[model samples]
Target: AGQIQVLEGLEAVRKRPGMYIGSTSERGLHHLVWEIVDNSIDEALAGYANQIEVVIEKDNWIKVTDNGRGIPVDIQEKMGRPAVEVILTSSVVNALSQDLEVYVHRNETIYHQAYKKGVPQFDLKEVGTTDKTGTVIRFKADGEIFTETTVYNYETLQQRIRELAFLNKGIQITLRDERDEENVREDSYHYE
Candidate 1:
């Protein structure tokens, strides 16, 4: 909400992030990460990308990265921000053709609070971009939703994601719980 056209940059991103996003609440934070993932999936749909990874950063921030072409940092004739940087903040996102693909991979953290099984309020934002590589989206999960510490099931999510990838054909999607390697236990729950 700068000048209607002079949308603020990262400073604004840090300050009035909500104005662009929606709320620093968990949903908004997840939205930012989703925005990144979806955009990279968009690249895959373009037949230029095949690998997309969505993971947890231990901290609340979620990371969405891909092997597809990175968001073009060049100027855009659209909204007038750092094209790639503004990609997520906007309400609309799409590829030029049907050949492109869009993928979504969510674990308990995001599914419970941001995507399905919850109210939808995407606070998408592009943190950084490079033409040589795919985009990376990192955002914190909304805290306003739940104040209690928790855990998610990577086994279940992995199966679900595998099905999604099979359905997409040629697209790769991985959902990981990067909580701590020490926390990994073979005696842990398993999914098939």
Candidate 2:
């Protein structure tokens, strides 16, 4: 049921993306960032993370990094796959993205995985070693799904991230725009 439910869930999101994320407009495109960022915020609320970073990369890809306990990589008995794989596969953001990648720094190792839409490109693999622990997610909004626009707005992101920092108090969050290699803009917020 775990695998079967994941496929069906992804199909539903793809078919009615608006139902899951409000609209395929620019607003919806930005909502993808919140969906991912919310998870990091939760980690912070759980007392595991103190720093979160959001980057708008070249070509509109969004990357979120958090200094939290990395997503669990242990095999999930229910899905017969890594817990991170199962969690990502079922995510609405993964279903809507044209491409998504995840890197988990845990167990003193860095594990990498990539996906197309919501399908795993390959099984999760150990890519390197790390002394730190956290999760990094990079995704490109699907042009086919978000036909209106896949671009992100820096000011819009800045305002919300600033507000989240104020509300959360202790977590430090940074937003950076790297779409223009010549001039990168960044804002950092920490209430406490």
Candidate 3:
């Protein structure tokens, strides 16, 4: 055994899924979107991949991309694979649920009171510098819970994402819903 005294990174989040991910309900299921969204948010924070675009495509495909710093394409020193793939497989130690697109955005109050510790380190490593950016995440929702279906709604989602962009003063989030073949609706706007 190399060192079985395991339990590192997001192990606790797995043990207490609710901690990082509210609950595995539709909101939680939707949270999968938010988790990835947070990555875009983080990128927004770092000023890489500054423009975030999310598309809830038809047939359960979800696409998230950012113009900011993309996930580090640098090969891992040990594994020698694309970091994004490592994140999708949950093999990387720090990529949260490895769901890269899944995690409980635990309430700050809860973490503060229960663990008496700071928030779990949900931050991604630097993809080098501010200008270095690119993050596109795509995943299919688990049909077992993602039952809510309907046409894509970009305006509703972007209404809020755009706020984040403006608040940050240089960010842009564009959401496109292509689930509706007839609609093919796309709405884009900016924030502060």
Q: Over the stretch 1-192, how does candidate 3's per-residue lDDT look in tens digits?
A: 211212343355445554565764545555666667787787678755557777878864677777654454445665554344345444221222222242211111111000101122333333222323355555554333234532233554666666666676666677777887888766655655
Highest lDDT model number: 2
Runs off by more than 4 Å, candidate 3: 1-16, 78-81, 91-133, 145-156
* TM-scores, each model vs. reference: 0.52, 0.98, 0.60
Ranking of all candidate structures by their lDDT, best first: 2, 3, 1
C-alpha lDDT of residue 106 in model 3: 18
Answer with 1 or 2, whichever has the higher lDDT: 2
Arrange candidates, best TM-score first: 2, 3, 1
Error of 2 at 102 (Å): 0.2
Kindly list the per-residue Cα lDDT of model 1 for residues 1-192, writing each as its tens digit: 432533333234444555655755544544444455556667877887887776765753456667765555445566544343344333221110111122222211111112211112342333333334554444443333223322335554455556656666777677767678666322111222
Give the poorly placed runs of model 1, Cα more than 4 Å off. Answer: 1-36, 77-80, 91-132, 145-156, 184-192
Q: After superposition, how far is residue 52 of candidate 2 from its true place, in Å?
A: 0.3
lDDT of 1 at 116: 17
Which should have the higher lDDT, number 2 or number 3?
A: 2
Of the two candidates 1 and 3, the one with more favorable TM-score, higher being better, is: 3
